[PDB]
Amino acid sequence: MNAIHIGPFSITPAARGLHYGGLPHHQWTLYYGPREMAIKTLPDSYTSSEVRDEFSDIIAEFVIDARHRYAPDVLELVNSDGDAVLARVAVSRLPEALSGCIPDDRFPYWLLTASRPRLGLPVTLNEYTALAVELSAPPLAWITGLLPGEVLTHDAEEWRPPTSWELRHVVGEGSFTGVSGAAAAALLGMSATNFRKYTAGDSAANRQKISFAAWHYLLDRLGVKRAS
Amino acid sequence: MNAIHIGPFSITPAARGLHYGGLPHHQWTLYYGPREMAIKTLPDSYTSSEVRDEFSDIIAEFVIDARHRYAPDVLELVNSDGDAVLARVAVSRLPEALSGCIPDDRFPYWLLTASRPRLGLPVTLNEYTALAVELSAPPLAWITGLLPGEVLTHDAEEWRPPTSWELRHVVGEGSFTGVSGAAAAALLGMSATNFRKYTAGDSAANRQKISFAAWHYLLDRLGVKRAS
Amino acid sequence: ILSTASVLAFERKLDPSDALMSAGAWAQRDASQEWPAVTVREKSVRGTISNRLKTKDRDPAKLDASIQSPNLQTVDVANLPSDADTLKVRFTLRVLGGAGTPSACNDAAYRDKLLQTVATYVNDQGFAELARRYAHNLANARFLWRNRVGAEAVEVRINHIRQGEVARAWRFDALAIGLRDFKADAELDALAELIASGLSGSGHVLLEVVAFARIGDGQEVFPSQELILDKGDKKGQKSKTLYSVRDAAAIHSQKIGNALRTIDTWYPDEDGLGPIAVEPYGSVTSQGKAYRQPKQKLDFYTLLDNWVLRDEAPAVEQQHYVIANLIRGGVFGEA
Amino acid sequence: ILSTASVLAFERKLDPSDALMSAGAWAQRDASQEWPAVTVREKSVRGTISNRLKTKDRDPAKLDASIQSPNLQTVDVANLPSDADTLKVRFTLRVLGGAGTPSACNDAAYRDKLLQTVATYVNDQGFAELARRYAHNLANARFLWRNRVGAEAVEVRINHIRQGEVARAWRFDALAIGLRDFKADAELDALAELIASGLSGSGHVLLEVVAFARIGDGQEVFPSQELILDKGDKKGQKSKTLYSVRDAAAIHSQKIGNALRTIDTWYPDEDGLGPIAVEPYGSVTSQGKAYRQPKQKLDFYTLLDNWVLRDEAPAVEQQHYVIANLIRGGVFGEA
Amino acid sequence: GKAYRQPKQKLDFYTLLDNWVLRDEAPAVEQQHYVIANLIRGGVFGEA
DNA sequence: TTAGCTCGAATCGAGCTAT
DNA sequence: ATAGCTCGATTCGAGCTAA
């Protein structure tokens, strides 16, 4: 039938068909871009919303694995012993002055990492809050692991605009954020027709590229980056 | 001579001169948009640097008064006794759960306003960290008090693009941020000529109005709004 | 080529005084020469924020904290006594001649051409319509700016003072003569002829203008306001100051001149919005709008340039406006 | 697109005067025109430590040391005479008309749209509900703020002063008419129609309101309190200053206007508090909170913007609130 | 010149009121009589 | 660093569509 | 909400001058 596109995923059918049993059948192939994840032979009587439900569990497992393997580093605020965790914050990057540390009594508050070779830094509550404000991680910061490092960089000379498939990771009905194109356009203060030109694929007539400020502001508003 | 522009300020000379003592003089008047601030009668042998140095003190006291008038309100983290301040955070807006409060001994940590009638709620270190992360004020948040509320709104249907004069609050060397126009264009990933087209005077044919995403990302990267 | 002169300073005709404002009772207003003056006193005001929020103050906790810390001010307030219901406002008016003659000029040829233009105006149509409209803004108490809005009964008494004694007295019901229409009336015609003789330079005209109004018993009256230096604390801020001469509340003379100056009904917009004070560029500060924009060919400067430099005489209404601007005076001319 | 105007200043209707406090005896209040005024005088107060201590002043030695140095100060105090049990408070109220017309407006199109909106309101339902509630706050002595809480009998007399004479007289029992319910009464209806004619602009109305409160012999009365610069010595501190005009205890006119303004029963929160003053963001100073939060889309500005700019007429209760806020007046519009 | 009902012995008005209202710890009937008498006399109770 | 200016190319909004 | 189009106006980058 038709190739079902769910965000960065694309379920394309086989051009030829087969007859498993007596009923008509086709091979549906799940794709994550150029990566093939599954082939499932399905009847032709299924609707698109039912093949979507058939392939939904593999997509859910992929999203769980992506969220787990790209989780931001967690910092821990502890007392002068290191046993009780008073507050924990997930950070996009570690503090600059972290070194290998074991808490002692001369300082009341210590900011240690969650990794077992715990780096640390003696802080007060005011400096801890300054570091937490500066270094905090957005709730959907795990999607940055699925994106290239040259589309997320803040250096304008080394920045490359995201493609349509890399843009489907963060905007779209079946995206990893779950926001529609109209909602993304409303977040950028532009028309939905212009954003559809950003998300347009294979239509070489009137296809546009997103800009540096628009891309980084969209990543700010969706909760993916720059939301410390 | 010619008018001297220092960020949002303008030192325009009188069209006709005068003689004070035996030397020619002109009256130089300082503006802040349409507001006349001060007038000085200065010798014709002064250069532009000396005329600017004559009004530098008035500009500096304007900057000091603007910093003190539009300073962000401060939240204070106190213990159960409510006397010792453990951390101070300056916030762009107050939490919606703030009510009239005197700290008890039922909860160890309390977040309170610095205002004399104190508003507050019991808070944990994790909740205080979350509130400080999502409410903190950028270091140049006082400049937003000098800008209208229809250029600083995130509602795209209530948003108006800033004018050249409102742009010059934050973009020039004589502005309140102190960054250049080329640095501001580098922050947005934009050409310097295109960004100069934004801050072009009224005596120009090529003038462009900045977009929603570009303006708000500029405010983010300058440390004026939405930077915590 | 007869270019415009580089200074055109004009002195003000229709020079008023500061209008001193005092209080008393109706039907004893004939013997109002010993009425006690309205004094400017101080009261304390407390209020909450009622202005629009910047969308940054729309956070409920900030609004509640602003209510819990209301702003405190002390203000000058003028009131009638609790036994007096009538306010008496008195000022003197001088009508001077030689309207078209500038006080300063750079060009003898330009000033000769301007004097010839004003002279041929006066010969063709003297100060008859302009003085008619001025008599009205005196017969209706437009100088009682906010003291006329809810007043039950307003009357004005204009006395022509010659050798220090009343030569002719006028009495008008200031609510009958509206603030919008320039109708015709016999006493108004006589006062208009007197003002015209003053403007023409054929005689000395000094008028004593006294207005009485039923504001109410003990009600608030509205003198003119001063600047606030804001050099004090934020609790005793002194946010409002009123004008007084020697302990009597008073109205600025320029406010009275603006009130009498409201005669311009010839601006290109509809005159159903009402008369405007004659100004260059027809400015109204309350409405924030400029009637007679320089983009249109109906402002004072383009009219004066076309009429004088290149003999393009405007319509008689627009030249009435030009001569009214010459009467009000001003620092005209380029620089 | 018809955006809102940046300058939207409004002038207030329902102008009250300062309310003067005099004293006398019950059953001679029909001859209370010569009652002596209540005089603000000085007395000395000695106080102990009665405020909360911040966990460092709670030491017994420090607390006792604070006891050994009590705060000595003088306070302005107003009391009835020992032979007088009735307090008389008299003020005059003027109702203007023309509520929907702003005093300053930047945009002419917004001005016209707002005028059409207010005219549509008045044509649909005039100033009848608002005037009825204002007449209710006149009939009960809500302007008698703390002098009503313990008064045994309160009677309010309201006269209509047409030509300096009582054209119509009202006598009310201010305790039968409570501070919670806006009921219907024939005399209340007549006063409502009079205030309605004032608000509509049909005629000039001036109301002289006199309230008598039987409190007790020598009992304390409560005029409005002023601001202290707080500069003198601690012993002669003058911690409390009372408002008087000429050696006569008085209540601020804006306090009277705030008490008459207490007609707003339509705020989203419950009816436990009852009516509140019609202010933008529904601010109550005593509770320190804002009913009609902007977040709840029921404040004055959001309702006015929806009603005028984009033709979203709210409920008739919110329309009454908006029109009462326009009667209240204020500096609306973006500064 | 001394203070009976010191805050240290937890019998002042403020501690009794806070325990009675917030913690729902009703004091003795005499102490709540004292608290209600303090409410009768009036005050400017409540610090920042 | 300020303050602009062409010139072709890409983008932007607001109209329509299709599925 | 997806998907895509046209069309005239606005923006955009990389040259350039001008100081």
Measured between beta carbons, the chain B residues lying within 8 angstroms of D52 are 102
Q: What are phi and psi of C60, to 5 degrees?
A: -60, -35
Count residue pairs from B and C with Cβ separation < 8 A.
Answer: 48
| C34 CB burial (10 A radius; 0-12, 13-18, 19+) | exposed
CA-based nearest residue to B103, from B125, B78, B86? B78
Long-range contacts of D173-179 (CB under 8 A, 24+ apart): D174/D139, D174/D140, D174/D141, D174/D144, D174/D148, D174/D211, D175/D140, D175/D151, D177/D136, D177/D139, D177/D140, D178/D140, D179/D140, D179/D142, D179/D274, D179/D275
Q: What are phi and psi of B15, to 5 degrees?
A: -70, -40
- Domain positions in chain C: 1-11+99-126+263-335, 12-98+127-262
D89 contacts D20 by C-beta, under 8 angstroms: yes
How distant is C1' of F1 from CA of B143, in Å? 23
What does each C-alpha distance from A106 to A102, A109, A119, C126, D63 come to in angstroms? 12, 9, 17, 97, 36
Quick one: which H or E segment has residue C78?
strand C71-79
| D65: amino acid identity, one letter | A
Tell me the C-alpha distance between C87 and C141, whole Å. 12
Quick one: which H or E segment has residue B31?
strand B23-32
Residue of E nearest to B102 (CA): E48
Tell me the C-alpha distance between B136 and E7, whole Å. 38
Tell me the C-alpha distance between D296 and C34, whole Å. 58
| Exposure on the CB side of residue A3, measured as CA atoms within 13 A | 11
Question: Which residue is associated with the tokens 């779950």?
Answer: A178
Work out whether strand D104-105 and strand A99-100 pair parallel, antiparallel, or are unpaired. unpaired
| Exposure on the CB side of residue C176, measured as CA atoms within 13 A | 9
Tell me the C-alpha distance between D154 and C245, whole Å. 44
- Reduced 3-state DSSP string for chain D: CCCCCCCEECCCCCEECCEEEEEECCCCHHHHHHCCECCEEEEEEEECCCCCCCCCCCCHHHHHHHHHCCEEEEEEEEECCCCCCEEEEEEEEEECCCCCCCCEECCHHHHHHHHHHHHHHHHHCCCCHHHHHHHHHHHCCCCCCCCCCCCCEEEEEEEEECCCCEEEEEEEECCCCCCCCCCCCHHHHHHHHHHHHHHHCCCCEEEEEEEEEECCCCCEECCCECCCCCCCCCCCCCCECECECCCCEEECHHHHHHHHCEEECCCCCCCCCCCEECCHHHEECCCCEECCCHHHCCCHHHHHHHHHCCCCCCCHHHHHHHHHHHHHCCEECCC
Q: Closest to B15 (Cβ–Cβ): which among C56, C59, C335?
A: C335
DSSP-assigned letter for residue B91: B
Tell me the C-alpha distance between C64 and B113, whole Å. 12
B32 contacts B9 by C-beta, under 8 angstroms: yes
**What are D334's two structure tokens?**
């973006």
C127 contacts C335 by C-beta, under 8 angstroms: no
Tell me the C-alpha distance between A8 and A26, whole Å. 22
* D182: CB partners within 8 A, 6+ apart: D132, D133, D136, D263, D265, D275
Contact between D53 and E2 using a beta-carbon 8 Å cutoff: no
Residue of D nearest to C72 (CA): D227
Tell me the C-alpha distance between B104 and A94, whole Å. 36
Question: Quick one: CA torsion of D227, D231, D235, D240, rounded to 10 degrees?
Answer: 0
Q: At what angle do helices D316-328 and D300-308 cross, to 10 degrees?
A: 110
A59 contacts A9 by C-beta, under 8 angstroms: yes
CA-based nearest residue to D15, from C220, E4, C84, A61? C220
Question: Which residue is associated with the tokens 């400029």?
Answer: C290
| D179 CB burial (10 A radius; 0-12, 13-18, 19+) | middle
Q: Which nucleotides of G are covered by protein (CB under 7 A)?
A: 1-7, 10-16
Question: Which residue is associated with the tokens 């800033």?
Answer: B162
**What are A114's two structure tokens?**
């969650």
Residue whose CA is minimally distant from G16 C1': B193
Cα angle, residue C183 at apex, residues C181 and C189 outer, rounded to 5°: 135
| C147: amino acid identity, one letter | N
**What are D244's two structure tokens?**
């008087």
Are chains C and D in touch, 3+ Cβ pairs below 8 Å? yes
**What are C236's two structure tokens?**
């005793």
How distant is C1' of G3 from CA of A203, in Å? 10
**What are B104's two structure tokens?**
């008890």
Within B95-181, strands assigned E span 99-100, 110-113, 119-122
Contact between B117 and C68 using a beta-carbon 8 Å cutoff: yes
Count residue pairs from B and E with Cβ separation < 8 A.
Answer: 10
Tell me the C-alpha distance between A74 and A52, whole Å. 35
Residue ranges near strand G (C-beta within 7 Å): A 5, 172-173, 180-183, 192-193, 196-197, 199-207, 211; B 189-191, 193-194, 197-198, 206-211, 214
DSSP-assigned letter for residue A137: -
C15: left (phi over 0), alpha (psi -120 to 50) or beta: beta
Q: What are phi and psi of D12, to 5 degrees?
A: -85, 140
**What are D182's two structure tokens?**
């806006």
Question: Which residue is associated with the tokens 């405010």?
Answer: B219
Distance from the Cα of B28 to chain A's closest Cα (Å) equals 40
How distant is C1' of F15 from CA of A194, in Å? 13
Quick one: which H or E segment has residue A134?
helix A125-135
In 10 A of CB B219, how many CB atoms?
22
Contact between B100 and D288 using a beta-carbon 8 Å cutoff: yes
Q: Closest to D290 (Cβ–Cβ): which among C41, C63, C287?
A: C63
Quick one: which H or E segment has residue C188?
helix C186-200
Q: In what order do the strands lie in the sheet with D104-105?
A: D104-105, D8-9, D331-332
Q: Could you please report the per-residue DSSP string of A147-195?
A: S-TTTS-S-STT-----HHHHTTTSSTTSSS---HHHHHHHHTS-HHHH
Q: At what angle do helices D129-139 and D253-260 cross, to 10 degrees?
A: 120
Question: Which residue is associated with the tokens 């005009």?
Answer: D245
**What are B153's two structure tokens?**
């709104």
Resolution in A: 2.7
CA-based nearest residue to C264, from C254, C273, C275? C275
How distant is C1' of G17 from CA of B196, in Å? 15
Q: What are phi and psi of C166, to 5 degrees?
A: -70, 115
Residue ranges near strand F (C-beta within 7 Å): A 189-191, 193-194, 197-198, 206-209, 211, 214; B 5, 172-174, 180-183, 192-193, 196-197, 199-201, 203-206, 211
Chains linked to E by 3 or more Cβ pairs within 8 Å: B, D
| B173: amino acid identity, one letter | E
C255 contacts C145 by C-beta, under 8 angstroms: yes
Distance from the Cα of C69 to chain B's closest Cα (Å) equals 7
E3–chain D Cβ distance below 8 A for any pair: yes
| C28: amino acid identity, one letter | Q
3-class state of residue C142 by DSSP: coil
B159–chain A Cβ distance below 8 A for any pair: yes
Question: Quick one: CA torsion of B121, B127, B130, B136, rounded to 10 degrees?
Answer: 30
E47–chain B Cβ distance below 8 A for any pair: yes
Measured between beta carbons, the chain C residues lying within 8 angstroms of D104 are 286-288
Q: What are phi and psi of C235, to 5 degrees?
A: -100, -50
Tell me the C-alpha distance between D67 and D235, whole Å. 16
| C274 CB burial (10 A radius; 0-12, 13-18, 19+) | middle
